[PDB]
């Protein structure tokens, strides 16, 4: 059984954690729940750690005593089709090889499932670390409260003798690193110095390998990602968020200054030898908004090149790291800004950028979000109950699993049916124009190498790339964000449309083109 | 097809109904749907009718226009169990045969089922008229639609050859009288002067032979029982409550003269030879507590006995025909007020009451009542559509079966289940007072027979016969009434536990003094 410690004892040495602690709704809650400082404390001084203290970062040590939350993050939503390819016809993309060839994502990009799996798929998927980690056997991917308790309970790996990133399996690619896993677990957020920058007090960085970080890693988001465990109040942890918001100076909703100013964060920062080394964000009010925004944004998280003059830019740069903060309108002005592309384009040649999840950044503007919606209005609610003390679901899911509890609770002059027809109305729609970008982006690709053969010249081929760049941004966006336009409707057409128009452009300057040739 | 005939033309004798008709919301709409009055027109004055016009009765000549409205009407409740005799262990009123012995309802009581039903129902149960009419075959017991379209579609008569009323079948009665008929059907609406009374211009009166009346007979419930077929405006057509609440100046809302002024009742009298003939109740709003309570009352339809002398009162007294328009601890001095009991009981020798579903005189008082409820917003509520045109479901059921549409439209706190547990708590409550009721008035009727071989004088009998009217009423108002409670469930229980108090003081009277001749 637990013994609990004198916190006094710590609270000599801690002094912010002291602060946090003594005032916040965990003031009753001693350390020896997440911390095994034993040692520690007999080795410390007021400036050097001595012995490292043991600190668990596994859900469980909240489940403790928050078993309702705890049971429903950890539920698996069976409905979720796992392991679903989006280049395909009846998915997200039907003509996503074609159009993202050259990327790291040709070789897999699967619809996300619940949450409990966000570690193992990551470490599992055929784009990441060359077929090197796998299930144990094909039973396990069921296994969601297993992959809670750690990756490595459920995973293999086909040699643990080396470390580096190599093809086990012949279509995979290696486009891990350790960016990456901010996004799908914080067991290393007290050895990772804030951005990933290098620190002597950090084991890792961006420019570690990223194979041995793997072995390191074991839950899937934490549960101290959005609460501080030291106050109990809200916060974010992701530093490519605190960068953004804070350091940066955008605020937590950059088109809104003073719901920015109601709705903001606080940069926190711990240091190593009196140096800074880790920052988190205490957020002025349990704003899912900005919680969900640690993961479902536009990011780099990887290499890149210059838009400039063509440069690599490593992971040891800064902008491998690094959060957009920016809607689809104002991508290519921050993409600019940092003079950063992501891949260049297989058959055409042009520069591209990479786009993912931009969940955030859509959801701004739209009525949902002037109105103060959150995320967890409809993917996190309260639970009803006859009788009972409520809670906040923690089974993030469509809100079509719960109408009543999400959609229905605020728009009472709906049935269900009629609400989840309102859904269906933008999904088709948006998914339409989806299509139709495709196809143009489609027939604009297929006529770079017939234009190539037919001689036309390169002023030309970098005119069409120019608007390649645009009519993939327009487009992709969209099959990165995950409501397929629910989240901001109006947006999402009028990029679509832009997408169509540009590749339109540059068919129509192809053709004429190649006609001229002919013839 | 229907031609129209010259409406202005009827209105140079009919003014009365000139002022209904050209002011109301059937003003376009033409006589010839109800009345075939060409030979009329060509014979009559203003003061001889001349030939009679023929006028539609059938529910069909406002399903032409009203189509919603009547095949809500004419619904079956198959769930509303049918010939479901009251007087067994699993219904209403398990010790009803001990009880009520010496009353023609010991031959038959069954539970109401659906409306469609009323009157075939009333012309086969076996206390009615001594079996002598029937279901075609068992099968026709379905067919809610061939009762509406009119009784003798689906029933036989064992001997058309005779109009007295006697048994065909050993163990049934023959309670049957013309005023019954009132409360299921009023084709005979043009053929029946007000009260019943003896009129040269009525074919029909409370004194006549009731089989000869049954077959001139065919449409329950009439859609005009409520609603003015020259106006459109709400009313009642049923003489004892018009009688009630105007002649006898009572009010639409005895407990409530402010109710009464507001939502009252303007009685319209028409005439044959200059004479008064028969009347109706207009109703200032369409308040259906009023409508419903043309047949869910306690009434006299019967013959019965003085409380003074024991003499008979005969069908053609008006006592015969009598809305008594009294709560249940009202209800004695009403019944002493017109000198009258329904029968003797055959143990006891007590003169008694009988009660028949108050559901009106019930309802009076209640939280429900007193916030401005009305039976419809419960049995004929509104239909809820996502499109469509809202009309009032003329579907007259159990709340269970639509409590979206009744209970939960009121109460937003309450999932459909805790509604139906507060309903439950209710009956089951008043029904095990019910139940205890009748145990002790069972124990109290036993003891009269030990009384009377014990030579237990005459004075202290009548005592306890005093006590048993009482014990009688508090108890029998409650199986009589339909909701086991729900309607006035304080009121329920006050009358039971003195039903239960007026028992045991029997009990007590009658023990104490056969042991003392005995001890
Ligand atoms: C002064 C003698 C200290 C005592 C008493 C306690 N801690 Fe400590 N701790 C101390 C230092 C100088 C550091 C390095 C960071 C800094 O603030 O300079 C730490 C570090 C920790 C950590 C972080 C460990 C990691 O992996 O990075 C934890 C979780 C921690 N300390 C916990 C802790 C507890 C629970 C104590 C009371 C039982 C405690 N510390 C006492 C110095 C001192
Ligand atoms: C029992 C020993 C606890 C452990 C282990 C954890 N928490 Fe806790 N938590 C506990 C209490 C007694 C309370 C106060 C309850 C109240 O409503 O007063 C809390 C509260 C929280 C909250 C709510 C915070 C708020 O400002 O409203 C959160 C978000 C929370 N706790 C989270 C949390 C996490 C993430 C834990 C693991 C790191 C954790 N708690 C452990 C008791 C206990
Ligand atoms: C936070 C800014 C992220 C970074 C950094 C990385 N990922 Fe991610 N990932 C993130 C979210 C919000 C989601 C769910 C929404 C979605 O559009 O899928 C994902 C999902 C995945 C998945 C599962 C789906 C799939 O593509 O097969 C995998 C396998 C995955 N992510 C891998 C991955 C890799 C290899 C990364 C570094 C190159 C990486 N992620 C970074 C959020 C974030
Ligand atoms: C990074 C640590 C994340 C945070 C914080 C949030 N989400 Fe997430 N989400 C993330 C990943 C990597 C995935 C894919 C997991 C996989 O294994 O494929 C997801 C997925 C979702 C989903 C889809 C669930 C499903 O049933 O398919 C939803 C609806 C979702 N995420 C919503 C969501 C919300 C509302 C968040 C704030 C409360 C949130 N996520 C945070 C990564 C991360
Ligand atoms: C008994 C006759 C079986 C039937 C019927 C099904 N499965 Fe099975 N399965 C069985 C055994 C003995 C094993 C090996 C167990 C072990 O761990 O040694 C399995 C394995 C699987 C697996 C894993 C396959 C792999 O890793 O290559 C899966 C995914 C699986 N079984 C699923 C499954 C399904 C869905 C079934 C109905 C279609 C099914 N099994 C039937 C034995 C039996
Ligand atoms: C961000 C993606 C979250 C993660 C990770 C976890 N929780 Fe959470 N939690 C989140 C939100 C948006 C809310 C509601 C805030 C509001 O005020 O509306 C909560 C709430 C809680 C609470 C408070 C009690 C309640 O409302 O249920 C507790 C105790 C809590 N969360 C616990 C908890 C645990 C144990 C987690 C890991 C299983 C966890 N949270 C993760 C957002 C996020
Ligand atoms: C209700 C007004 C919403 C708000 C606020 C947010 N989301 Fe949403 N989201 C919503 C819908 C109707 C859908 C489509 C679901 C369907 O079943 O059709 C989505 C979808 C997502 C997804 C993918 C879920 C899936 O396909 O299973 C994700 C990952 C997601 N939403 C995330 C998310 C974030 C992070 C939000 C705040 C920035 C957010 N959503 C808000 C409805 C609503
Ligand atoms: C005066 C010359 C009349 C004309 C024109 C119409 N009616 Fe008549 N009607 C008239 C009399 C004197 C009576 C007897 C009752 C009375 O008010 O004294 C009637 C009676 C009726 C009835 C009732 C028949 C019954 O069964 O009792 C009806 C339904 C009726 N009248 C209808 C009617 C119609 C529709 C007419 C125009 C087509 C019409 N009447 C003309 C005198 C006169
Ligand atoms: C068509 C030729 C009709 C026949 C036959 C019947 N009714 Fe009618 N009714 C008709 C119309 C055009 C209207 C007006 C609709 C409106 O909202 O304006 C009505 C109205 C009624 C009403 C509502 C009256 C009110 O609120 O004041 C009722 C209760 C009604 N009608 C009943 C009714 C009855 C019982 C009929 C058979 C005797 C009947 N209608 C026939 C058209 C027609
Ligand atoms: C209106 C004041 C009524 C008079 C006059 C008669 N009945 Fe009736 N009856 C009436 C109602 C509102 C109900 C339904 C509620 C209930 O408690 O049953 C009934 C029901 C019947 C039934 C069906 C149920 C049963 O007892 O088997 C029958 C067979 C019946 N009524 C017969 C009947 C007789 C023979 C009457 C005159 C002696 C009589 N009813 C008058 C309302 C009214
Ligand atoms: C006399 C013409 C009636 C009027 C006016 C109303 N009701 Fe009635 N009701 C009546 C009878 C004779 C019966 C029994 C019919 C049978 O054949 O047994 C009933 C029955 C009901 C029921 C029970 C229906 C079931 O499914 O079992 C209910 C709920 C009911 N009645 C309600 C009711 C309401 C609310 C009325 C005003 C709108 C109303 N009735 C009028 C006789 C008569
Ligand atoms: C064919 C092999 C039959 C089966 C199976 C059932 N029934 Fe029947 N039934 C059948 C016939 C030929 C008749 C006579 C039809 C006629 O009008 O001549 C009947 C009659 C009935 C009746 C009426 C009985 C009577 O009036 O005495 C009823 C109530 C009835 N049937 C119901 C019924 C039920 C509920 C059945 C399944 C339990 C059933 N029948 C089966 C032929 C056949
Ligand atoms: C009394 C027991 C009724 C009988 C018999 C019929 N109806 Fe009715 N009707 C009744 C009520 C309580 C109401 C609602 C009044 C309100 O304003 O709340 C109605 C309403 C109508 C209407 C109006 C349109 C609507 O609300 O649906 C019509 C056209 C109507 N009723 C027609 C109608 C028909 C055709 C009937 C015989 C099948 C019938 N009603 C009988 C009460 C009563
Ligand atoms: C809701 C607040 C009601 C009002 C107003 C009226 N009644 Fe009612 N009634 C109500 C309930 C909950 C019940 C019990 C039904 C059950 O399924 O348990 C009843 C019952 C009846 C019945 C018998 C119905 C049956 O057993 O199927 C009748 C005949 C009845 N009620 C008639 C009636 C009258 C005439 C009303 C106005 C005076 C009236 N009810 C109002 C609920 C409500
Ligand atoms: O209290 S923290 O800064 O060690
Ligand atoms: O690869 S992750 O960003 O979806
Ligand atoms: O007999 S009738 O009144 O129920
Ligand atoms: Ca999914
Ligand atoms: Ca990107
Ligand atoms: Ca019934
Ligand atoms: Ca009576
Ligand atoms: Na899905
Ligand atoms: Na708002
Ligand atoms: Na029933």
Not at 109 to 118: I, L, T, V
Not at 432 to 438: A, L, N, R
Not at 486 to 505: V, W, Y
């Amino acid at each position: 059984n637990l013994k609990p410690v004198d916190a006094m004892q710590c609270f000599d040495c801690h002094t912010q954690i002291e602060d946090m602690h003594t005032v916040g709704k965990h003031a009753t809650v001693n350390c020896v729940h997440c911390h095994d400082a034993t040692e520690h404390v007999e080795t410390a001084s007021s400036r050097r750690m001595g012995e490292r203290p043991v600190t668990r970062m596994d859900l469980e040590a909240c489940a403790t005593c928050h078993t309702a939350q705890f049971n429903s993050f950890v539920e698996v939503r069976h409905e979720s089709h796992p392991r679903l390819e989006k280049a395909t016809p009846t998915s997200r993309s039907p003509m996503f090889d074609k159009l993202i060839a050259g990327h790291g994502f040709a070789f897999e990009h699967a619809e996300p499932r619940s949450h409990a799996f966000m570690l193992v798929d990551h470490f599992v998927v055929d784009r990441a670390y060359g077929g090197r980690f796998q299930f144990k056997n094909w039973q396990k991917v069921t296994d969601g409260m297993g992959a809670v308790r750690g990756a490595w309970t459920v995973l293999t790996d086909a040699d643990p003798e080396s470390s580096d990133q190599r093809r086990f399996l012949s279509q995979t690619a290696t486009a891990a690193n350790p960016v990456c896993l901010n996004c799908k677990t914080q067991d290393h957020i007290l050895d990772w110095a804030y951005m990933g920058d290098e620190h002597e007090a950090a084991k890792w960085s961006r420019t570690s390998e990223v194979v041995e970080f793997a072995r390191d890693l074991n839950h899937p988001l934490n549960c101290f990602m959005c609460h501080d465990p030291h106050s109990a109040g809200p916060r974010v942890v992701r530093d490519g968020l605190i960068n953004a918001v804070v350091d940066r100076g955008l605020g937590t909703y950059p088109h809104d200054p003073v719901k920015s100013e109601q709705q903001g964060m606080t940069k926190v920062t711990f240091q190593r030898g009196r140096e800074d080394f880790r920052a988190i964000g205490l957020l002025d009010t349990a704003d899912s908004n900005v919680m969900c925004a640690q993961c479902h944004v536009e990011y780099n998280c990887n290499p890149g090149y210059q838009l400039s003059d063509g440069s690599r830019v490593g992971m040891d740069d800064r902008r491998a790291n690094h959060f957009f903060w920016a809607n689809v309108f104002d991508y290519k002005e921050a993409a600019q800004e940092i003079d950063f592309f992501d891949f260049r384009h297989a058959t055409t040649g042009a520069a591209l950028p990479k786009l993912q999840h931009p969940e955030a950044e859509t959801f701004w503007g739209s009525v949902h979000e002037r109105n103060g919606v959150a995320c967890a209005d409809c993917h996190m609610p309260k639970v009803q109950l006859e009788n009972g003390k409520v809670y906040t679901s923690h089974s993030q899911r469509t809100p079509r699993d719960m109408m009543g509890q999400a959609c229905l609770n605020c728009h009472a002059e709906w049935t269900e049916d009629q609400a989840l027809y309102a859904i269906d109305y933008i999904k088709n729609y948006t998914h339409g124009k989806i299509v139709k970008s495709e196809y143009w982006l489609a027939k604009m690709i297929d006529l770079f190498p017939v234009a190539k053969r037919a001689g036309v010249s390169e002023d030309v081929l970098n005119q069409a790339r120019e608007l390649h760049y645009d009519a993939h941004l327009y487009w992709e966006w969209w099959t990165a964000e995950n409501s397929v336009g629910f989240h901001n409707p109006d947006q999402a057409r009028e990029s679509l449309m832009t997408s169509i128009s540009k590749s339109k452009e540059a068919v129509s300057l192809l053709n004429d083109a190649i006609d001229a040739q002919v013839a």
